């Protein structure tokens, strides 16, 4: 059972799962139960699926089990605030996609894998890791007793894997820039229509980006602690790059730590602030995410100024 104090807190966008590690599997079950009913999946199947998903996140500093549940929780808060707008299969597909979105991540970006001719880059040309994370999701669903979508029809089973596949591919940041530009135009003119499937996929796509970057929408002490974990992974990539005779970008160079506040400032102005601004225009109840992002942009502007 979930403690009473958490039941109120889990609904809010700023909830930090950080302090409840032993409760993360149960928090995911509670979010699924609240989002699509107590008989959303056969409980025994769901629990085996969750533990296998947990076992398939590596012990890397950032793209680990904790990140998967953080992203899942952010999606739950979007779905709890945007009732009736999402179908039952979408609510169901999106929570699973979020838990699985970074499965079997090795702490290396697509650029490294594409630059050092890694076997995964030969198999998957673009969105290299995201195509591997989707493959890991399908392999897990196909394990004995792990098929949580057994109750669905053929038509429904193939729809949910498609919601999941597009959702996991939308977590490739390289695709975010164009997707947000198209949504921004559609909204400003008045073309945006959620009944059109292509628009829906785009709206879901940006929700996946919002969820995946939600460490920038927590209270400042949490945002700062997560950033140290992201950088430990980025700096470990840059160290391998140095060993292979390639000077890494500043963001992955541990000798360039002093550029972090300015790098953070640019990531908020170019990536995160526009993401949550566009999301807020389409889904007004998601406003707390933009407000929290703005509060952390102000904290980074304070670090650079010397406050
Ligand atoms: Mg990812
Ligand atoms: Zn992620």
């Amino acid at each position: 059972t979930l403690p009473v104090r958490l039941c109120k807190e889990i609904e809010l966008f700023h909830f930090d799962i950080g302090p409840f590690e032993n409760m993360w599997p149960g928090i995911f079950v509670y979010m699924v139960h609240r989002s699509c009913g107590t008989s959303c999946f056969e409980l025994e199947k769901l629990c085996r699926f969750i533990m296998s998903v947990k076992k398939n996140y590596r012990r890397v500093p950032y793209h680990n089990w904790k990140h998967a549940v953080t992203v899942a929780h952010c999606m739950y808060a979007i779905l709890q605030n945007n009732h009736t707008l999402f179908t039952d299969l979408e609510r169901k597909g999106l929570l699973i996609a979020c838990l699985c979105h970074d499965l079997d991540h090795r702490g290396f970006s697509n650029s490294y894998l594409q630059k050092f001719d890694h076997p995964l880059a030969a198999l998957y040309s673009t969105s290299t890791m995201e195509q591997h994370h989707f493959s890991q999701t399908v392999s897990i669903l196909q394990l004995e007793g792990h098929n949580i979508f057994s109750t669905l029809s053929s038509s429904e089973y193939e729809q949910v894997l498609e919601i999941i596949r597009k959702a996991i591919i939308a977590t490739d940041l390289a695709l975010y820039f164009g997707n947000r530009k198209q949504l921004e135009e559609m909204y400003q003119t008045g073309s945006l229509n959620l009944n059109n499937q292509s628009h829906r996929d785009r709206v879901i796509g940006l929700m996946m980006t919002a969820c995946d970057l939600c460490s920038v929408t927590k209270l400042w002490p949490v945002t700062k602690l997560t950033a140290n974990d992201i950088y430990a992974e980025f700096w470990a990539e840059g160290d391998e790059m140095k060993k292979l005779g390639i000077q890494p970008i500043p963001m992955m160079d541990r000798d360039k730590k002093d550029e972090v506040p300015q790098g953070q400032l640019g990531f908020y102005n170019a990536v995160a602030i526009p993401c949550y601004t566009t999301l807020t225009q389409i889904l007004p109840p998601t406003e707390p995410l933009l407000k929290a992002c703005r509060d952390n942009l102000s904290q980074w502007e304070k670090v650079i100024r010397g406050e």
Side-chain angles (χ1 to χ4, degrees):
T1 187
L2 185 72
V4 174
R5 180 172 48 74
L6 296 204
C7 294
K8 276 180 171 71
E9 287 184 281
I10 269 165
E11 298 302 299
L12 310 187
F13 291 106
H14 54 269
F15 182 62
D16 169 30
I17 70 164
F20 309 103
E21 178 165 30
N22 67 300
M23 297 177 151
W24 294 344
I27 290 158
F28 186 75
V29 170
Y30 171 101
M31 288 185 302
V32 165
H33 285 183
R34 287 293 304 279
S35 74
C36 35
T38 314
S39 304
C40 181
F41 303 120
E42 201 278 283
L43 184 64
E44 204 177 16
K45 276 163 166 161
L46 175 63
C47 294
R48 292 212 200 80
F49 178 83
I50 291 158
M51 295 308 292
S52 280
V53 167
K54 178 177 185 292
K55 194 158 63 183
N56 285 292
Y57 270 96
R58 301 199 176 195
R59 203 150 206 89
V60 293
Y62 182 60
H63 293 118
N64 50 39
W65 175 230
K66 176 185 176 160
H67 172 64
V69 181
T70 294
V71 173
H73 168 268
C74 189
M75 178 61 74
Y76 171 74
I78 296 169
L79 303 170
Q80 289 293 101
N81 275 259
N82 302 287
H83 292 287
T84 62
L85 198 144
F86 293 101
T87 66
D88 169 69
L89 241 57
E90 291 164 326
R91 279 197 289 275
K92 199 185 302 209
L94 291 185
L95 284 163
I96 292 291
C98 282
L99 199 71
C100 291
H101 89 275
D102 273 325
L103 267 168
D104 196 47
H105 199 299
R106 294 102 184 281
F108 290 96
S109 73
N110 287 347
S111 67
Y112 180 101
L113 303 166
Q114 284 146 21
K115 185 66 163 191
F116 298 103
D117 293 320
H118 191 274
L120 276 40
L123 174 55
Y124 309 114
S125 183
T126 65
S127 309
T128 305
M129 284 308 299
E130 301 74 12
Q131 289 186 357
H132 176 69
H133 304 317
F134 176 63
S135 165
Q136 288 282 292
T137 307
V138 173
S139 300
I140 286 172
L141 282 173
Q142 293 169 350
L143 287 174
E144 195 190 339
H146 290 66
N147 211 337
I148 57 162
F149 299 120
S150 271
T151 290
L152 300 183
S153 72
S154 33
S155 188
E156 282 191 316
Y157 180 80
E158 73 173 82
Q159 276 175 88
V160 79
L161 287 187
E162 197 58 26
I163 291 164
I164 290 163
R165 191 188 69 76
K166 289 172 182 154
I168 293 182
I169 299 288
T171 76
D172 180 0
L173 253 195
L175 305 177
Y176 157 68
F177 299 92
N179 183 54
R180 176 255 155 184
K181 198 185 181 184
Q182 290 275 272
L183 285 170
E184 183 61 25
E185 194 167 7
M186 284 175 192
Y187 172 77
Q188 297 257 330
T189 68
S191 166
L192 190 59
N193 179 30
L194 279 288
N195 194 71
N196 171 206
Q197 192 57 68
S198 60
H199 290 196
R200 237 176 147 73
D201 292 342
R202 289 205 179 282
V203 169
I204 286 158
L206 181 74
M207 288 158 55
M208 293 300 288
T209 301
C211 292
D212 196 31
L213 304 183
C214 76
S215 59
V216 309
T217 70
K218 303 305 180 184
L219 297 183
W220 171 238
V222 178
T223 296
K224 198 162 62 258
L225 283 169
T226 303
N228 294 323
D229 299 353
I230 286 162
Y231 283 103
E233 196 164 298
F234 290 162
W235 295 331
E237 179 164 319
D239 290 356
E240 297 305 304
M241 287 187 74
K242 295 208 188 201
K243 289 161 55 171
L244 308 180
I246 312 210
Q247 198 67 17
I249 65 172
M251 186 214 216
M252 303 192 170
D253 198 337
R254 67 169 75 257
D255 296 355
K256 303 198 193 281
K257 285 169 191 85
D258 296 324
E259 294 187 32
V260 168
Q262 186 58 247
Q264 289 292 120
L265 193 75
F267 183 81
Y268 279 70
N269 292 302
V271 188
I273 294 284
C275 168
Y276 300 112
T277 292
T278 307
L279 187 78
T280 293
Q281 286 164 6
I282 301 175
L283 303 179
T286 69
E287 208 163 304
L289 296 168
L290 177 59
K291 191 224 192 182
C293 193
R294 286 165 170 174
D295 292 330
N296 293 329
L297 166 61
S298 297
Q299 296 299 107
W300 285 113
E301 290 164 337
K302 282 167 63 176
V303 164
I304 296 153
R305 290 197 313 269
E307 277 91 304

